[PDB]
Structure formats: C-alpha cells, structure tokens
Amino acid sequence: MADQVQDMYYLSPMQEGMLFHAILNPGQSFYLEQITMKVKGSLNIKCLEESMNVIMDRYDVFRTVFIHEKVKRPVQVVLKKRQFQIEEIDLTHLTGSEQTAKINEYKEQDKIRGFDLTRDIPMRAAIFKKAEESFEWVWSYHHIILDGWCFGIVVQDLFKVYNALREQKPYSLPPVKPYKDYIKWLEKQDKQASLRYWREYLEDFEGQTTFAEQRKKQKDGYEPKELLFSLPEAETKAFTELAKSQHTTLSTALQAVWSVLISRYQQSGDLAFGTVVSGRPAEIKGVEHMVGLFINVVPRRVKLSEGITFNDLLKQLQEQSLQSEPHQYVPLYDIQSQADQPKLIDHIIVFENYPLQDSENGFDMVDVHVFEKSNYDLNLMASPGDEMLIKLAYNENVFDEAFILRLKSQLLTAIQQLIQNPDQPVSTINI
C-alpha cells in the first residue's frame, strides 16, 4: 500500500541482471549466500533479533522488494517498516546425529527455497539450539541487495547494537547515505561510453581456455573441492610492502603474480581472468559506508611484453584499475557481448575479507562455513592477515587435486621470486 511505501526506484544494471536470472531459474541457489555458524556461549536470541530489527530500519535494502510483473521496467520498492523474525528451533531432545540431520535438511531446503524477491525480506536467519550454550545459526541472504563488503558493515553494526543491548548502555550509529544515491549516480553515467570502454579494452582479444591441457572432460557436473594454504608471515609482509612501494594494492599484486603464471601455461602474453572490483565510485560522498550491491566481477586483460618486469606489471594493472573505475557497473554479460565472447573469462581471482571468522559478544563463533554456488571451475580467493590466506576452490571433475597442489607450489615460489626480483623480467621466474 502506498502508505507503507517509503520509496521506489529502478535497479542497477547488475541488480536487473540478477533479478532476470533469479526469476528464470527458481530453485537453483542463484545469488544465495548461506552462512552456517556454530556458536558456543550465552547467545541471547531475543537480543540478536532486536539488533537485527535495528539493522532492518537502518539500511533500506533490507526493506526492499522487487516488482517485475505488469510494469514497463523492474522497480525496487523500499517499505517503511518490516519486522524481522529469527526462526528459533529447539533440537535439544535429539541426538547429535539427529541434530546434524535436521540442520542439513534445513540448509538443503533453504538453498532450494531461495528468496521470492517480490515479497520476502531478502535475508533470513534460523538458530538451532543443540544444547545449553550450543547453537547453530544459519544466516541466508540474496546478493541482489548485498555484496560482501556491505555484508561486513551490517555484521559490524549488528554486533555493536547487540553488545550495547547486552551491556545495557546507550549507543548510536553514524548517519548513512541511502543506496538510492548510488542508483541516482548511475543515472548520470553514459552507458554507451561505458560499453565502449570495455569494447576497446577487450579489442582483438582471442579466447583462452585456461589450463586447457589439465582440464578433464569425463565426469558430469561440479564436484567442489578446496585447497587452503597460507603465505608465511615474512613473505606476506614483504609482498605487502612491495605493493605499497609501487602505490598499488595487495589485490593488484596478487593478480599480477597470477598473470605471470597464466602467461606460462597459455604460452601467451595476452591473457584474461575474472577479478572482483569494488564498484564504489569515489565521487559519491560516503560510498564506502553505504550498504547495497556494488561489487562486480569484470575481466582483467593483461599484456606481457618482452622484458616486462613485475613492477611494470603492477603499474599496468594499477593504471587500468583507475581507468575502469567509472565503468565497473556494467554487467559481465554485457561486457562479454562487447567482445563477442560469451566465455571470455573462465576463472576468477578474488581478494576479500570475511567479516565472520572462527568475549565481547558473550559467545564464540567456533566454526563458520559459507555456501555460494560456484560459477567457474577454478577460483583463487585470498584474504588479508599476518599470513595471507589463499584458497584454491575448484571443480575436481575438471581439475585434479594434484594439479591444484602444483598451482599452490608455483604460486608460493613465484611470490617469493617476484618479491626478491620485482625489477627483472618476469620471464626469468622459475615455475
């Protein structure tokens, strides 16, 4: 009802693409993030639920629903108020194995259910009580309203409010600019110019099947496996110092190392891979604190000339990052149409924190597992820390475990060698 509506506005191109595929592929876990937290301690579910309702009121995207039927163009509608409820389930009368079964049953049905974006709050939570001070919290949300960085903001706020309610002390949260300001910014962007930026960037790129000689083609479907390792502290510090000394980021430096490795396997100096970009335009005041969907997967195309050094590559990538910033809102589908290559990239490199990791909150998160549908057969996911954390997540029906172990070995030695000689040709790095 109009009286219940706060606001209405169009979708970002990325949101619009997600709504389209979400509607067209119900039941397939598209765009669903499901986090399972094992919790030990005196979690107060009522307090957590009050905290979640402060978050609901604070960030318009949680009160947003989507309309696609009987309209010229989809719209997102912000409701003035929506009450969040945590589903509380008591499993204390079940055996351990029976508890695991009930929780896995919930998680599997949750993936299939997804969200009805025309009516549901695009976030939900179930908390299973397994014993006194023993819980599992399954937190689900849809990426059409929230990317990872924005999720981190929400987590921070949620636990700031929870802890103030627990300590029975006043609190405040700083003002936030609403997500509609990003939608307004998009209005001012020349969409054809952004398509042209990508068309020119990808001009004359010839396709690439990455690690073609290692790809198996036998077993059907995705068999998800992961290899986790850490870069030692000394190397992590030196790699971080190197990135900063070249006025770039850890993420760009990791992409640069990867480029060297890909160039060898592809026997080519023109290569591409997927990268996650923030999508937060600097000209938007306070964008870094907004909550919504900004982060995008875009192609990175790297060109290695004879003699190119690692510091040369850092400069190349850093400059391209800056040039791409106004155009990071373009969906990958539209980008890849500008190259006439629907499979232009076939793996991704992601550098990110996770705000939930395994005192203050009165309880411990003893385990955290994240489910997200996998769109590529290989994904390199790194996270900052005293030891940089690197995860190679892959489809074992395509890549052998032995090959992923070889990539780990090659990554580690390449990083070590490039730290030591960032001003020699990268062709001299032994892998």
Author numbering: 5 to 362, 369 to 441
Task: Quote the paper.
We also undertook crystallization of the C domain covalently fused to the upstream donor complex, the 10-undecynoyl-NH-ppant-T domain, but crystals of the didomain did not grow. However, we also solved the high-resolution structures of wild-type SrfA-C, and comparison with SrfA-CFA structures provides insight into the origins of the specificity shift. Although the terminal C domain in surfactin synthetase is known to tolerate some changes in its native peptide substrate, we sought to expand its substrate scope to nonpeptidyl acyl donors. To first test whether SrfA-C has any latent activity with inherently less reactive fatty acids, we examined its ability to process 10-undecynoic acid, which contains a terminal alkyne for bioorthogonal labeling. Although activity was detected, the fatty acid was processed >15 times more slowly than O-propargyl-Tyr. The lipid substrate of RzmA-Cs sits deep within a pocket in the N-terminal lobe of the C domain, and comparison of the structures suggested that expansion of the SrfA-C substrate pocket between the core β-sheet in the N-terminal lobe and the fourth α-helix, close to the active site, might improve 10-undecynoic acid recognition. We therefore prepared a large combinatorial library in which hydrophobic (Ile39, Met41, Trp143, Tyr145, Phe155 and Val159) and negatively charged (Glu37) residues lining this site were simultaneously randomized using degenerate codons that code for small and hydrophobic amino acids. Structure-based considerations would certainly have included mutation of Glu37 to a smaller residue, as the side chain of Glu37 blocks the fatty acid pocket in all crystal structures.
Nonribosomal peptides (NRPs) represent a valuable source of clinical therapeutics. These natural products are biosynthesized by multifunctional enzymatic assembly lines, called nonribosomal peptide synthetases (NRPSs), that use dedicated modules to incorporate each building block selectively and sequentially into the peptide scaffold. NRPS modules typically possess three core domains, which perform substrate selection and activation (adenylation or A domains), shuttling of activated substrates (thiolation or T domains, also called peptide carrier proteins, PCP or CP domains) and peptide bond formation (condensation or C domains), respectively. The enzymatic assembly line that produces the microbial lipopeptide antibiotic surfactin, surfactin synthetase, consists of the following three proteins: trimodular SrfA-A, trimodular SrfA-B and monomodular SrfA-C. The modules are composed of several functional domains, including C, A and T domains. In the current study, we re-engineered the donor substrate specificity of the SrfA-C C domain (green) to enable direct acylation of the acceptor Leu (residue 7, yellow highlight) with a fatty acid rather than an amino acid.
